[PDB]
Design a protein around this ligand. Structure first.
Ligand SMILES: Cc1cn([C@H]2C[C@H](O)[C@@H](COP(=O)(O)OP(=O)(O)O[C@H]3O[C@@H](C)[C@H](O)[C@@H](O)[C@H]3O)O2)c(=O)[nH]c1=O
Length: 385
C-alpha cells in the first residue's frame, strides 16, 4: 500500500519550520514508503539544513522526497491523498480546489507547533469544517497522551546509545569538525538566539575550576559570543581561550550531523522546536531558549514543559534547572544559578537518559500520522478497523 502526501511549508523565519517538515517528509518516504512532495517557499533555507539540495532547482528528489519550490504564482497540480498544511501556512487556492475535486477528497491536516500544555489534548485530531465543504484536522505534537507524539526516526535511540558508548566514534566525528576534546573538559554546544544572559554565563564558565569547551555552530548567537570575546571577527574554525573556557566555532552542519554533535556534548543549549526535541533524544542535559512572543505568551509553553520535565527530577535539581531556564529566557540571568546546576550535571544526565527512554517508547509522530490516515480512510468508506 502507498498513499501520496503533500506537505506545505512557509519558511516564516529561521530553520525550524522547514527543519520539522523536512524531518517528517524524510520519515514518511523512508520508513513508510509513502509518496511525498514537500513544498517550500524559500529554497535557500532548505538548502542549509540539507546541503545536498540545489537551491535553484524547481524540483528535485532527495532521500525519496520530491522537494518542489512553492511558486508565486502557484502552478496548479493535482492534490495528494493527504495534504499537510504545516503551521497554518495557508494552502494555495487552486490546490484546495484540486483536493475537493478528487473522487476521494484529500485528508486535510494542519500540523501544529509542539506544546507541553495540557489543553492540546482536548484539541488533538479535532475536525473543523471549512467553507468549501472540506474538513481540516488539527494535529498537535505532544509530550503526553492524548497528542500527536514527537518526531523520532526508527532506531534513533539504538544508534544514539551505540554512538555514546563508543569513544572512538565520538572522537572520529569531532575530528571531522576539527574538534579535539581535552581530558576533563566538559563539552557544551550553543544554539540560541541573541541573549543578554550569555555574557554572565560565559563569565562563570571562564572562572570555573573545571574547564569547558563551547562549540558554537555559525548563526545568530555568534555576534554575542564575539562581543564577549572582545573580538571583531568570529569565523568557522576559530578558537579562543578565556581561562577555563575554550570557545570554538563550528560550521552550520547537516541536520543528521547536528544530532551527532548533540550526542557528543555533556550539555546542549538549543532553541525553537526541532533542536529542542533532538537534544532530548540525545539523553543529555539541555538548555532551551524559546523566542519571545506577543506580550509574554512564550512563558506558558516554557512553564508547561518545565512542570513535566521536572516532575521526575529531585527537588534540588528541579529548582536549579527552573531558575536557570527562566533566567536564560528572561534576557538577563542570575550570577550564581550556574554553580548550583553545574554540581548536579552527573545526576541530571542520568535523569535525561530516563526521560529519553520513557519518551522513546511512545509511538512516534510520523507513525500516528500514517495511522490517522488509515483510520480516516477506513471510516470514509464506513469500513471496520
Ligand atoms: C545548529 C544547527 C541546526 N540545524 C537544524 C536543527 C533544526 O532542525 C533546525 C533549527 O530549527 P529549530 O530547532 O526549531 O530552531 P529555529 O530558531 O531555527 O526555528 C524556530 O524559530 C522560532 C521563532 C519558531 O517559533 C519555531 O517554530 C522554529 O521555527 O536547524 C542543522 O541542520 N545544523 C546545525 O548546525
Amino acid at each position: 500500500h502507498m498513499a501520496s502526501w503533500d506537505i506545505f511549508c512557509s519558511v516564516v523565519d529561521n530553520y525550524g519550520d522547514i527543519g520539522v517538515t523536512w524531518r517528517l517528509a524524510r520519515q514518511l518516504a523512508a520508513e513508510h514508503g509513502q509518496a511525498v512532495r514537500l513544498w517550500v517557499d524559500e529554497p535557500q533555507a532548505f538548502a542549509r539544513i540539507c546541503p545536498r539540495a540545489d537551491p535553484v532547482a524547481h524540483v528535485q528528489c532527495l532521500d525519496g522526497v520530491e522537494v518542489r519550490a512553492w511558486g508565486r504564482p502557484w502552478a496548479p497540480v493535482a492534490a495528494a491523498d493527504v495534504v499537510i498544511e504545516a503551521f497554518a501556512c495557508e494552502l494555495p487556492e487552486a490546490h484546495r480546489q484540486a483536493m475537493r475535486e478528487r473522487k476521494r477528497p484529500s485528508l486535510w491536516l494542519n500540523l501544529e507547533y509542539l506544546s507541553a500544555e495540557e489543553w492540546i489534548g482536548s484539541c488533538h485530531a479535532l475536525p473543523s469544517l471549512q467553507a468549501c465543504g472540506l474538513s481540516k484536522y488539527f494535529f498537535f505534537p505532544g509530550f503526553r497522551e492524548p497528542s500527536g507524539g514527537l518526531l523520532r526516526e526508527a532506531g534513533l535511540l539504538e544508534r544514539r546509545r551505540r554512538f555514546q558508548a563508543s569513544v572512538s566514534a565520538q572522537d572520529e566525528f569531532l575530528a571531522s569538525l576539527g574538534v579535539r576534546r581535552k581530558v576533563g573538559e566538559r563539552l557544551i554546544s550553543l544554539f540560541a538566539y541573541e541573549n543578554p544572559a550569555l555574557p554572565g554565563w560565559l563569565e562563570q564558565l571562564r572562572d570555573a575550576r573545571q574547564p569547558s569547551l563551547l562549540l558554537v555552530p555559525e548563526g545568530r548567537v555568534l555576534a554575542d559570543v564575539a562581543d564577549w570575546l572582545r573580538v571583531a571577527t568570529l569565523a568557522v574554525g576559530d578558537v579562543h581561550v578565556r581561562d577555563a573556557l575554550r570557545v570554538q566555532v563550528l560550521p552550520f552542519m547537516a541536520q543528521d550531523d547536528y544530532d551527532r554533535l548533540l550526542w557528543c556534548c555533556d550539555l546542549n543549549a538549543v532553541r525553537g522546536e526541532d533542536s529542542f526535541v533532538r537534544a532530548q533524544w540525545a539523553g543529555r542535559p539541555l538548555l532551551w531558549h524559546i523566542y519571545r512572543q506577543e506580550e509574554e505568551t512564550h512563558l506558558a509553553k516554557l512553564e508547561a514543559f518545565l512542570e513535566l520535565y521536572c516532575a521526575g527530577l529531585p527537588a534540588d535539581l528541579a529548582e536549579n534547572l527552573r531558575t536557570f531556564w527562566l533566567a536564560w529566557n528572561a534576557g538577563g540571568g542570575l550570577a550564581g544559578a550556574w554553580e548550583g546546576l553545574e554540581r548536579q550535571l552527573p545526576e541530571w544526565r542520568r535523569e535525561a537518559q530516563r526521560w529519553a527512554d520513557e519518551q522513546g517508547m511512545r509511538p512516534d509522530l510520523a507513525a500516528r500520522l500514517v495511522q490517522f490516515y488509515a483510520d480516516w480512510l477506513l471510516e470514509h468508506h464506513h469500513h471496520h478497523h
